[PDB]
Design a protein around this ligand. Structure first.
Ligand SMILES: NC(=O)N1CCN(c2ccc(F)cc2)CC1
Length: 185
């Protein structure tokens, strides 16, 4: 891909984070804490899952960013509508305002309804995410494997401003404590 030139500087929005997340001072890294992180509750926070949004909102143009997933066993990444549900149970699907992929139990899947099996030969340590707002496209790239395509959502019906979307996953196993990190340009 030749998408690097639409690079955008993404930062995480503390106010949207699940109350167990720890966001770094520079707002570029997030990880699961061992406990509640001593913040007040609000209507923006994701309640059920270890999710957080980027601060940036996109309503036009082409945007690209990269995320480090090194040594994580579980995570979700992509974009979502600014108006997605925050409280209670929900599935990650375009019908609910999410355009995502994930790792879970040694398999990679795209957040379609129902979910779609991904074919990745080289387990990625960094993922590139490309959004073309006007074209209705969200694409995912394997930076570890020379930028190879992972998945393209096309004919997307965004239906509002988009925000970068992150899930660090639970850490029941003790093997998923590693952070998600926004990689430098
Ligand atoms: N202070 C902590 O408890 N951390 C932070 C660093 N961290 C980690 C990072 C990379 C990796 F590959 C594996 C684990 C574990 C959680």
């Amino acid at each position: 891909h030749h998408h690097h030139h639409h690079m955008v500087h993404i930062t995480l929005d503390r106010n949207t984070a699940n109350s167990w997340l720890i966001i770094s001072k520079d707002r570029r890294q997030v990880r699961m804490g061992d406990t509640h992180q001593n913040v007040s509750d609000n209507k923006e926070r994701f309640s059920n899952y270890p999710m957080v949004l980027g601060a940036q909102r996109f309503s036009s143009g082409k945007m690209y960013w990269e995320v480090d997933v090194t040594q994580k066993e579980a995570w979700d990444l992509g974009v979502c509508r600014d108006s997605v549900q925050r409280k209670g149970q929900f599935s990650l699907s375009p019908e609910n305002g999410f355009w995502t992929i994930w790792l879970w139990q040694d398999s990679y899947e795209a957040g379609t309804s129902p979910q779609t099996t991904l074919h990745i030969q080289v387990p990625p340590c960094q993922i590139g995410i490309f959004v073309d707002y006007e074209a209705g496209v969200v694409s995912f790239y394997n930076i570890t494997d020379h930028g190879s395509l992972i998945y393209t959502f096309s004919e997307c019906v965004f239906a509002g401003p988009l925000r970068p979307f992150f899930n660090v996953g639970f850490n029941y196993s003790g093997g998923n404590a590693a952070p998600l990190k926004l990689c430098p340009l």
